[PDB]
Every structure is written in structure tokens, then in C-alpha cells.
Ligand binder design. Sequence first.
Ligand SMILES: O=C(CNc1cccc(F)c1)N[C@@H](C(=O)NO)c1ccc(Br)cc1
Ligand SMILES: [Mg+2]
Ligand SMILES: [Mg+2]
Ligand SMILES: [Zn+2]
Length: 890
Amino acid sequence: EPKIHYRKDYKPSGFIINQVTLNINIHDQETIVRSVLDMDISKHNVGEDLVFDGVGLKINEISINNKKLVEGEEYTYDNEFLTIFSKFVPKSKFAFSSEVIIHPETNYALTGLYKSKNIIVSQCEATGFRRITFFIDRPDMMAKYDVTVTADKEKYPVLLSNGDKVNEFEIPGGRHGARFNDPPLKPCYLFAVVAGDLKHLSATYITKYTKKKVELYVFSEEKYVSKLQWALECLKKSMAFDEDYFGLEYDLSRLNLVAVSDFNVGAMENKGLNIFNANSLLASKKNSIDFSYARILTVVGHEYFHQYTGNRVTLRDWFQLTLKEGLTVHRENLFSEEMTKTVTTRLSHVDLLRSVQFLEDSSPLSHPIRPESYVSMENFYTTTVYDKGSEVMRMYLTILGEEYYKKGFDIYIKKNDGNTATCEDFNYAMEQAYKMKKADNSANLNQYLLWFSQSGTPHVSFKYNYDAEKKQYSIHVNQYTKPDENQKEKKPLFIPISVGLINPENGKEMISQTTLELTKESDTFVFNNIAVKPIPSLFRGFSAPVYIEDQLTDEERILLLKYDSDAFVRYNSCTNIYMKQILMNYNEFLKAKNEKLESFQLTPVNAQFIDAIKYLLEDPHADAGFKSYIVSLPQDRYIINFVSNLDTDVLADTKEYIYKQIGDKLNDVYYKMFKSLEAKADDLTYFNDESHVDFDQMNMRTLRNTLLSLLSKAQYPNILNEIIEHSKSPYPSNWLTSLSVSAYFDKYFELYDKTYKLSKDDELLLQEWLKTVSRSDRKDIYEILKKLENEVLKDSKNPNDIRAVYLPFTNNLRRFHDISGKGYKLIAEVITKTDKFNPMVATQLCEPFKLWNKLDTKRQELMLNEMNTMLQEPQISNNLKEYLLRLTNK
Ligand SMILES: O=C(CNc1cccc(F)c1)N[C@@H](C(=O)NO)c1ccc(Br)cc1
Ligand SMILES: [Mg+2]
Ligand SMILES: [Mg+2]
Ligand SMILES: [Zn+2]
């Protein structure tokens, strides 16, 4: 009886918690938590027992109105629920109090109160607050918080919680306390406490409209405080963006960001006290790869934007998760697009969605962005809820345009500020803007709500007609979502299709900006006074989260790739050319294998496509990040959505052939660009200025490192010389790339030892080194992973360490999917081992298995055997069991 929670079952509690008064006393062997809950009986009360969530708590005593309750007669506790029998529950306002013991030192699951290195830190979302003290641990129980933290002063000089610090005091025996009062109501998942020997950088921010001074503090352990500078700049940028785009100011006197080494995810938006995985807050040019800079910008931005979308407007219940996470990812994405000013930012989010999230949505794990049920709330945090949620949130902007979107968002904030909300509240606010935009009080967005309830990726397909005599162009559009286990019957969605029409003679735009509103299963959109047969530029900006079936020829796609104005359609046209090639070569390789052919033919790569790649690479005005995408084949996890029973060896052979076909024609171009890009890509002018971040320059390094990888796999003449020189670059993105691309040479372990020595004295850099080794294209990768286990990883319980060692390796198409199943067995062993102390990270480590039923039948069987073996572990967590049961359709 695992307990399934159903969305439709939501009901308000029969109780109210008005005030929380906490005393958290941190000692060497245990932490004592005293809590007084000022409570009341709600209008929904029907005489029920008072049931608190409380997981793993050691009760010293519990009381109601300062009378101790007697265990067994007046309450029972089973280590997960505290039940006070209703006859002992007061009928009016009452105080519930308790003193419990918890043990952050041994809390390796990193939820509740835990110790990360020498920092005590909390993580309460989603169900962590009940691991600190008793509570009705659900986001609609809004309360005021008065929190006192005490600790050894020498070990823990910096004490932080939500709200204003109202008192600091000394305590006999070398201890000290601080009291924080946070009067605004909040759900308990936004509570946080931090204690440690933290060092900070700080700044003052003056808000745009009210001219309020906000103190900004960024904290880390002392060793890494020099890595906080970029994060502080990102925070300032985030504040300014919400002010400028949304007209939203921060409301509190202070905002703290804190980095900790042990963290299950990226960061957490606790009010006034955002807590980060160190890998998403700390960077320096000497000790971080380039990706750290966009990561810190987006994660700092993301947690900041939660202050409105999640904190001030919060959730009624956890099924609304996408209302704060999809919306905050959308706000994050707008922010990062404006901050980076590169088209690759949007392309990178599409690239993530169509690989990772599309795979999830065609898997047995498929769910709508608002699921109907759950067992483990932690399994709800998914790329579907986050990234498809973000695309659903972004479609409102595409449909409404900026002006009316901003009006609708402001309606949402004004109407729900300080309250809980549901997805309907957001859709209602957008609907008001829709009415305004359409000048039609009857217009509604009722159909739009299916984006919240309908799982699965829509497929959108096209047919075209041009009447030259009439100058009349027609686009016939069809939408189809495959039935799945959530809906037998799928319904047509409100799909906005941003379109242009390119004149194939001169590459020019043929019509103004147009967004087709597809609301039926099919429609025909006609355009008059189209002087010449156009090439349609469909779903510009990737305007809906769908499979696009453009039915264009490769000649048409090539022309869009060269000449269209829209970065996404160019990238997608290139993607589609590659996919046609991959599917064709895959089937030719497969047939040869199946028929045991002694000889056979392969269809070559389209020569005009290769010419078009060359043309774009040689265009000095073209974006270097975009160029890096066009020379890269689509992600394996994008491809697998298009192949049944995918044989990973055959796919590996297919990609190799296509990369070789192209490199045989373009390697001299790749080499020449690799060399000519050096000066601007590796410019050291601002290497010691942590405020100066140039996303274009970083994209040129991406392009250089992509080209170097291509040339190294090709064994381009004397490229090992370039690899060795590149290992001497000051930039870790370069010298770690030199390690990875040296895999094809006898110098690999020389560079392995060199880069280890460069990486070993920075915690986060070492983790980047581990990832690079893990992802190295090495025939001896299994022996290398054993070396990492024995010599570096050891028995670390740090999630960054475990993820770094194992997850990149699972993208090794040839070796992770070794037909013996040894790679599946390896990851399953790591999952089961990790599950003993950290169920959430154990489920993250399951991610390679998400495509299990898409592989060839033997690998299906191998993966299924490992997950059935994992499901049979007597000690399996609820999180892992529920995940594997759903993934294996059991
Ligand atoms: O750090 C991230 C990265 N996103 C993310 C992570 C895991 C799965 C997934 F689909 C997306 N997410 C934060 C967040 O939303 N911070 O605001 C978060 C996630 C889970 C919980 Br429990 C609390 C917080
Ligand atoms: Mg305990
Ligand atoms: Mg199923
Ligand atoms: Zn979030």
C-alpha cells in the first residue's frame, strides 16, 4: 500500500498553522529542534485526528497548550506520521509544541537538515521540512516563521535563515545564537537554515521604482570565496531583468545566495536564502569550464525569478509544480536570451527538449506537465514539468505577443500575489489578455488547458500547394498525438505556428511575421499575392513543443539553412537533413547485418548539403555557436525517437560513416578554421576579470573544440601536435578538451595525468575532469572507470562526484551499450549502492534506462533484467521502486 496521491483529491486541511517558532540547537553529535506551532481549526475540519508529517524524528516530548502528551494513549508515531487522537485535539486556537532530535551529520540523502563538508544546511522542497520537525508538510499551509539557530561559534560563525536577523547573542560554552523573524506567510518548503564558516562577497542594489536598498550577499566556504564574483553579477543582472521586462522589484531588504558542495540538484529558491550546488554558483576563469558561466547565470536567474513565480505567488498543491517551475524556466530562458545575445541560447533549450524531454514523453514515464497522481513527490521533478512546462509557458508569449503577454502576466501577479495558485489561475490571466488582444470578450483559452493535462508530443505535418497563375500559396497542417497510457483518445491542441515564407530566388522574406493558430486536428492556411513558389519557414523560434514533419526536400532545407532569417528553422532544417541521412544509412547498415551481406552499398551524404555547411562555416558573420551545431549530428537521444528497436552498434556505425563522409570533404576547412579562430577564441585580455564574460568568445571556443574533436577522430595529419599545444591553454574548456580528444592517441594517459594534476586542488574542477575522463572515447573505458573508482571517487557520497564518474559514460553509444550488458550492470550496481543513502540521486542515475524499450530486443532484455534485479533489492527506497515500476510498465 504505497499511497497514491491524486490531483482531483485535493482538499484544504482541517487545520491551520499560523505561526512557527523554531529553536534549532546544533550540537556535535545531534541537533535539537524545538518547535511551537500556533494552530487553529479550519472551516473544513470534520473532527479528524491531528496528523503531522514527521520522518525520522526522535521525539523527546510533544505537548498541546504546554501539557505533555502521553504516547500510545494520546498520540502514536510510526517514524513517518505523528497522530494525535482527535479527542485530545483542542476545538479552538491552540499551541502544539515538540522537541525532537535529528542528526544532520549522518543525513546523506541531503534532504531535511544535513551537513555538507563543514556547513549545516537545509533542503526542504518538496518533503524535507517534515525531516526537521513535525508539520502539515504541504505548500498550502502558509505560516509566519520565527527561527532561532544556535551553534558552536568557532565551527559555525555564520548563521542564516529566512527573514530579518532580529537578535544575535552569546551562549555559555563557546556557543552563540541568532534569531530570524520572517513575518510574510510562506509554505514550509521555502524555509531554510544555514550554519557554517562562510565567507562572502556583497553588494548593494537599488530597486528601479521604489529605490529600495537591497543587500546582496553571496557565500561559500573560505577556500572558494574568490569564485563568487560572477554569481553576484548574475544576481544583479537578474534583478534588473525582472524590473525591466516585468516591472517586478525585489521586496526584501536582503538576498543571500549560499554555495554548498553536496546538493541533490542545481539550486533552491528558499525565500531570501537561495542555496546552490557549488557547481551552479562558483566559477573562476582559471578553474572552471566555459559552461559554468552560462550555468551560474541561468541558475542564479532561475532562483531569483522564483521570488515572484513560486515564492510570492506559491502553489496550492504539488500537482501545480509546473506553474512555478515551467514558468520560472520560461522567465529564466527570456533572461538568458537577453543576457547572452546569442542564438545558441534558444537553440540549446530546444536541443535539450527534443532529446531529453521528447524521449521522456515517448517513454513509459510519459506524463502531462500537470500529472494526475504521484507516489514520491521527488519523482515529479522532471524535464517534462520543467522544460515542456517552459515551452507551454512560452507559447502564451508567442500567441499574445510581448505587449499583451506582459499585460497578462501582470494580471497573474496582481491577482495572486501573496496567495497559492493553480495552473487555471495562470491560464485565466492569459485568457484576459487574449480577450484584450482579440478585441473579443467571447475569446477563451479553454482548449489551451489541454497543454497541462495531455501527455505525449504532438506531431505536426504539412502539405503545400502553390498556384502560380493565382499567386496563391496553401499550407495544409495536420496534428496528431499518439495514444499512450494517460489518454486513450488524444485531442487537438492550440498550436501556434510561427511562419515565414522565403523566396527561393533571393532568400528574402515574402510575408510579414505571422503566427498560424492551429486549433483543429487539421487546417489549411492560404496566402494570396505570393509572387513565386516559396519555401516555408515553419515553427520559427521552435514555436510549439512538437515533432515537426516539414515534408520539404533536402534542396529546400538546404536553401533555408543558407538563407532563412530564423536560427531555429536553419538549425532544424540541418537537423532534418541529417535525420534523413541517418535513417537511410541506419537501414542500409541494418539490412547488411541482418542479411549477413559480404558487400553492400551506403547512400552518400548529399554533396550540396556539405557545400552548404562549408559556405556557412566560411561566413565570418555567422554565429560560431550556430556553426558548432551544424557540424554536429543530432543527439543520440533525439535520433532514438525515430527508430524502432534501435541497434546502438548500427547507429554508431551510421554516425561514423556520416561524420567520415563530411570530414573527408571538409577537414581542411575545419583545420583552417580551428587555426584562424585561435586569436579571438583564446584571447586572455580579460582572463583575470571575473566580471567580464563574453558568450560569443565562449561560443568560438566551443566551435574550436568541436572542430578539434572532429579532426582528432579523423586522425587529421599531425593533429596530435595541435592537441598537445591545446593542453597548454589557460582555459579549462581547452585543456580538458585536449584530454578528451587525445583519447584517439598514445598521449591519452600523459594528458590524463597532466590534467588531473591541473584539476585535483579545485573540488569543482576535479569533477569536470572526472566528467571528461568518463566521456572519453576509450576502448579501455571500463578499466579507466575502475581506476577512477579506486583512485579518485572511492566511497564519496557527494552527488556531484558520483554523477561525474558515471553519467557521461552512459552517453558512450558503443561502450555503455556493450552487448554483454556489462555497462547496464555497472550503472545498476551504482544505482542500488547509491539508493542506500540517497534515493533521489539513485533515480537520477536511472536516466540511461529511460530508453530501454526503444533498443534492439537483446538490449531491451539486458536492461530489463537489470531493472528487475534492482526492483528486487529488499532495501529499495520508495523513490527508486516507484520510478522503476513505472519505467518497466509494472
Ligand atoms: O536545480 C534544479 C535543476 N532543475 C531540475 C532538477 C531535477 C529535475 C528536473 F526536471 C529539473 N531544479 C531545482 C529548482 O527548481 N530550483 O528552483 C529543484 C529541483 C528539485 C527540487 Br525537490 C527542488 C529544486
Ligand atoms: Mg532521525
Ligand atoms: Mg505503464
Ligand atoms: Zn525552480
